[PDB]
Amino acid sequence: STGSATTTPIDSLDDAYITPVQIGTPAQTLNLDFDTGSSDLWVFSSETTASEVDGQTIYTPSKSTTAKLLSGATWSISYGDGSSSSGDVYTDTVSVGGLTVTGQAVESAKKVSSSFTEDSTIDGLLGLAFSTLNTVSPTQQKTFFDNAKASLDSPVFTADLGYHAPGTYNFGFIDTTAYTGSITYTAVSTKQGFWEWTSTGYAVGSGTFKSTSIDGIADTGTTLLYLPATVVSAYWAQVSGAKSSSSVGGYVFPCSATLPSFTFGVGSARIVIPGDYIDFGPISTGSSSCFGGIQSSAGIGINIFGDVALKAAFVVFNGATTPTLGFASK
Q1: What H or E segment, with its residue span, contains residue 146?
Q2: What is the CATH code of the structural domain delimited by 5-174?
Q3: Could you tell me if 119 and 184 are in contact, meaning their C-beta atoms sit under 8 angstroms apart?
Q4: CATH number of 175-330
Q5: Among all residues, which ones are annotated catalytic?
Q6: Which residues contact 203 (CB under 8 A, 6 or more apart)?
């Protein structure tokens, strides 16, 4: 089997992408944030505290003839941005782009943190990291991909995120028309539960490539590119007037600037992030200070190849017995 679904930016900055997901019988379609940095499929629901729902579409398990309470199971998750959610668990039929999994754990939120409530466009998350990170207790549950894997034509999914435009998540096949050149594959460590890999270096604009190992994670659920402070300083030094602002929370730059590209290495291959992809717009409405799309990871503990980096590539998440990542230009 295969599946293919379009993923759509939630706003004009590409802050996140939403993908329609069919849950239950008859289908209830929710727009979920596909997140290769986490491993829970959770949804706003009829059980979510009413004051914490503000415009989201909810899953109502009592209206699904295939929903079953997973007795005794609870979940609770906290994300790298400080947001969180928790609740109970149903199993139900879940379909993405024509690919159907029966008995998928659907984690129904009883509580969500304010950042979720305040974003009416995201109805929940669909985790695509390794199932070892799934938070369901006392019986850990599998991700949608883990459940589908054995049925897929090939045990892979691909992320093809658009810049200021829709893109595609495919399951079970590589669309050889969706990229240019060849796909370069690189080793993955699953020891932290992530799609963790080592970039071979970077360049700023037309500058020389610096060969240096940068361990980080491929994370579709993170907006920005978070890299070591040395790398980030080298980038922003090429933008007149850019500076790190403790009060804003990162590097800002004059909105009048033209940003240089940023290249990262995948083995001997190179992925070029155009400068425009690094502009996240005014820090507040009407400001002439703009927020940068490359930020320091120093306070995180891990480097994160988020959407800024991934949307410059066609990315293969190869879930074979020994997982690997592939990157191609497009």
Answers
A1: helix 144-148
A2: 2.40.70.10
A3: no
A4: 2.40.70.10
A5: 35, 199
A6: 209, 210, 262, 263, 270
